[PDB]
Every structure is written in structure tokens, then in C-alpha cells.
């Protein structure tokens, strides 16, 4: 069996009437599916626990997920090896704690609410990989480190120091956050994971066999930034926001890395260094996207690869052959590196 626990926020106000109706109808379909559980509500927050066959639960939650009456849906716990149910008598019991006024339920009310709003704060500071792991039914703290092949992605803002010199601090942060939101959205939809931000740089990774997705994500980021630049208001700093991107492939260690009190679930490896160093060369090479021979050969799609150079760095005392893709978008983005060499004037008249 599978028991699932999630929380969510009302998309819009709901009345006790509407709440019960959701419950009453939940209880119905749940009876029909031998799934049981409890649904609570407290000041515009839903808490629900469901249990039943993995097959069934997954489909219910697929509908619950697509329901527009709540949002910010977060699975706190997925137990995918349950052999006994916790709420056998309740197909779907509803407990509206707002309406409740009981002696002991009152202090617990103020507790749940404080606990929930604190959890919601921590969520905003938490790697996306962690919640994914949790929803796969795994406690991320118990994952042991492993060697794995990854494609590593590194990208940063071209001439970022000029932004930081010229703009008000609120503007600088707005620009970086816009950049990060664009990269993160595209990378995530393409099956990758954004694992760290450092300065104005994004570090991300894809499964080792997913070079075509790494490359497509990268091209989509360039395309999206192009839309963002040419759609931005007159005088906006966004009109001169350009990216450089570097991709590398290698065996890295994945796992919980950090101090006692603070860890990240992330990767450690030479491919990370190589990706970052490739990305640094975007300027010298006048190419907005640059990647290693290994990424190129590992890709299966018929991209228009162009060989750029043979270069060195580090370490293994070896020269690495460096590629890009030749198309209208990469040419426009690569011309963008030139444009971004002199944006100080533009930026200081905002």
C-alpha cells in the first residue's frame, strides 16, 4: 500500500460549505476505491493524508494536483511500502478546524499554523531536488553517496560586474533573479536539476545519457533570453541581459555534502570544474554556448556542431576539444557577448 501526506493553500477563499462538499465527494470516490484518510483545513491551508493501492493513490493525487481550488501543493511524506492503514473507518473524514472551538484543539491550532508557515518559509530556501526525493518516498538524509555519470551545466550573466556597478541594489537583484528564474524553469522542464547558484552563476546537471536534453535546454535558455531582451521596456536593464553557457560530461559523486548542520544534496567532481572553465571561455571564443567533445559525441540528435578550438586548463595535463552549435540563435547570442562588452553607458542612464 501507499500512504501519502500533503499540504496546500486555498487558491481563493472557500467556505465551510465548499469545504464539506469537497469532503463529501472525496469520501464518495474514496469509498469506491478502498482508499481511506483524513482532510483538514485551517486558515486557508489544506492538510490531507491518503492511503490505498499505489495504483489508485497515484491517480487520485494526479487529479488533486490538477485541481485549481488549491495551489502550492507539497507532499510532506510518501510511504510506498505500507501494509496497514491509519484511518480504516474513514473514506474521507473532514475536520474543519476553523469552525472548531474545543478546549485542547485551540492551542494545537495556533501550533499547526505556526509550524506550517515556518515550513513554507523553509521551502523557499530548499533545493528542488529534496522535495522530488521526498515525493519519491525517500528521506533525502538517508541517501548514500554514489558515483554517477552527469552532464554538468554552468551559466552566468555576461558583464554582470557592470550591472552591479551601475544599478540600484534592488535593480541588480531583480535582474539576477529574472535570469535565474528563466534558467531554472527551462532546465527543470528538460529533466535537469538546478543544484546551486553562486554569484550570478547557475550550476545544474542532467543524467549522463541526456546530452540532447542538456543541449536543448541551453538553446531554449538562449531563446528565452532573446524573448526577454526584445520584449523588455525601454531603458530596462533586461534589454542587455546576455548569458554564456558551458556543458561538460563526467563521472561525479552525488550525495549529501556539507557541515553537520547544513548540507546540500548535490554533485562533486571534475566535470563541474570543466563545465565552469568551459563557460568562462565563452568570451574568448565569442560563442555563447560551448561544450566538450564528450558532450558532443554523447548526444544522439543531429545538431549542427561546429568545432571551435583545442584548449587546456588544470590538471590532467590534457587539451580538450571544444564545440558549439551553429544556428541563428547561437550566432545572435554570440554577437551578444560583443554587445555586452560596453553596456555601462546604457545601464547608468536607467
Ligand X SMILES: Cc1cc2nc3c(=O)[nH]c(=O)nc-3n(C[C@H](O)[C@H](O)[C@H](O)COP(=O)(O)O)c2cc1C
Task: Please enumerate, by residue number, every residue annotated as part of a binding site for FMN.
Answer: 29-30, 48, 63, 67, 69
Angle between helices 328-339 and 211-231 (to 10 degrees): 60
Q: Contact 220/153 with Cβ under 8 angstroms?
A: no
Quick check: 146 binds a second copy (CB under 8 A)?
yes
Distance CA 166, CA 345 (A): 9
State which H helix or E strand residue 319 sits in: strand 319-325
Among 21, 25, 143, 147, binds a second copy (CB under 8 A): 147
Quick check: 42 binds ligand X (CB under 6 A)?
no
Distance CA 348, CA 125 (A): 32
Cβ-based neighbours of 216, under 8 Å, separated by 6 or more: 190
Interaction mask 84-123, ligand X, x per CB under 6 A: --------x-------------------------------
Quick check: 176 binds a second copy (CB under 8 A)?
yes
Distance CA 61, CA 70 (A): 13
Q: What residues are designated binding site? A: 29-30, 48, 63, 67, 69, 156-157, 159-161, 200, 269-270, 273, 279, 283, 310, 321
- The distance of closest approach from Cβ of residue 335 to a second copy in the complex, given in angstroms and rounded to an integer, is 22
- The distance of closest approach from Cβ of residue 22 to ligand X in the complex, given in angstroms and rounded to an integer, is 5
Part of the chain binding a second copy (CB under 8 A), chosen from 18-26, 113-121, 227-235, 336-344: 113-121
Length of the chain: 350
Quick check: 60 binds ligand X (CB under 6 A)?
yes
76 binds, among a second copy, ligand X, none (CB under 5 to 8 A by kind): a second copy
Distance CA 138, CA 255 (A): 13
238 binds, among a second copy, ligand X, none (CB under 5 to 8 A by kind): none
Interaction mask 7-46, a second copy, x per CB under 8 A: x------------------------------x-x------
335 binds, among ligand X, a second copy, none (CB under 5 to 8 A by kind): none
Whole-angstrom CA distances from 269 to 144, 146, 213, 216, 294 are: 16, 12, 21, 23, 15
DSSP conformational letter for 195 = E
64 binds, among a second copy, ligand X, none (CB under 5 to 8 A by kind): ligand X
- The distance of closest approach from Cβ of residue 45 to ligand X in the complex, given in angstroms and rounded to an integer, is 10
Q: Which of residues 45-74 bind a second copy (CB under 8 A)?
A: 47, 49
Distance CA 232, CA 187 (A): 22
DSSP conformational letter for 215 = H
Residue 32 or 181 with smaller CB distance to a second copy: 181
| Beta-bridge mates of residue 194 | 204
| Backbone angle region of 347, left / alpha / beta, with phi > 0 → left and psi within -120 to 50 → alpha | alpha
Among 2, 4, 7, 48, binds ligand X (CB under 6 A): 48
Distance CA 234, CA 256 (A): 45
Q: Which of residues 290-319 bind a second copy (CB under 8 A)?
A: 314-315
Part of the chain binding a second copy (CB under 8 A), chosen from 51-59, 60-68, 125-133, 279-287: 125-133
Amino acid at each position: 500500500m501507499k500512504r501519502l501526506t500533503y499540504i496546500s493553500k486555498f487558491s481563493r477563499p472557500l467556505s465551510g460549505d465548499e469545504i464539506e462538499a469537497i469532503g463529501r465527494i472525496s469520501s464518495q470516490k474514496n469509498q469506491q476505491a478502498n482508499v481511506t484518510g483524513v482532510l483538514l483545513c485551517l486558515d486557508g491551508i489544506f492538510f490531507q493524508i491518503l492511503e490505498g493501492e499505489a495504483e489508485k493513490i497515484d491517480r487520485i493525487y494526479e487529479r488533486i494536483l490538477a485541481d485549481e481550488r488549491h495551489t502550492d501543493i507539497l507532499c510532506l511524506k510518501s510511504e510506498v511500502e505500507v501494509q496497514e492503514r491509519m484511518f480504516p473507518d474513514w473514506s474521507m473524514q473532514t475536520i474543519n478546524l476553523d469552525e472548531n472551538t474545543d478546549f485542547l484543539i485551540r492551542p494545537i491550532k495556533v501550533l499547526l499554523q505556526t509550524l506550517t508557515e515556518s515550513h513554507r518559509i523553509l521551502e523557499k530556501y530548499t533545493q528542488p531536488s529534496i522535495f522530488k526525493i521526498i515525493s519519491q518516498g525517500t528521506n533525502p538524509l538517508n541517501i548514500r553517496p554514489k558515483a554517477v555519470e552527469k552532464i554538468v551545466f554552468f551559466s552566468d550573466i555576461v558583464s554582470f560586474s557592470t550591472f552591479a556597478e551601475k544599478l540600484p541594489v534592488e535593480e541588480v537583484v531583480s535582474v539576477v533573479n529574472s535570469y535565474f528564474s528563466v534558467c531554472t524553469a527551462i532546465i527543470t522542464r528538460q529533466g535537469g536539476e538546478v543544484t546551486k547558484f553562486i554569484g550570478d552563476c547557475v550550476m545544474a546537471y542532467f543524467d549522463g545519457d541526456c546530452a540532447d536534453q542538456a543541449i536543448q535546454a541551453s538553446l531554449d535558455i538562449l531563446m528565452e533570453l532573446e524573448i526577454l531582451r526584445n520584449s523588455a521596456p525601454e531603458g530596462s536593464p533586461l534589454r542587455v541581459l546576455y548569458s554564456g553557457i558551458g556543458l561538460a560530461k563526467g563521472k561525479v559523486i552525488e550525495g549529501n555534502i556539507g557541515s553537520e548542520l547544513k548540507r546540500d544534496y548535490t554533485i562533486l567532481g571534475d566535470a563541474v570544474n570543466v563545465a565552469a572553465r568551459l563557460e568562462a571561455l565563452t568570451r574568448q571564443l565569442s560563442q555563447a554556448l560551448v561544450f566538450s567533445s564528450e558532450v558532443k559525441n554523447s548526444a544522439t540528435k543531429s545538431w549542427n556542431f561546429i568545432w571551435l578550438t583545442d584548449s587546456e586548463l588544470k590538471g590532467k595535463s590534457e587539451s580538450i576539444d571544444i564545440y558549439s552549435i551553429d544556428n541563428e540563435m547561437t550566432r545572435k547570442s554570440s554577437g551578444g557577448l560583443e554587445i555586452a562588452r560596453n553596456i555601462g553607458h546604457y545601464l547608468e542612464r536607467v
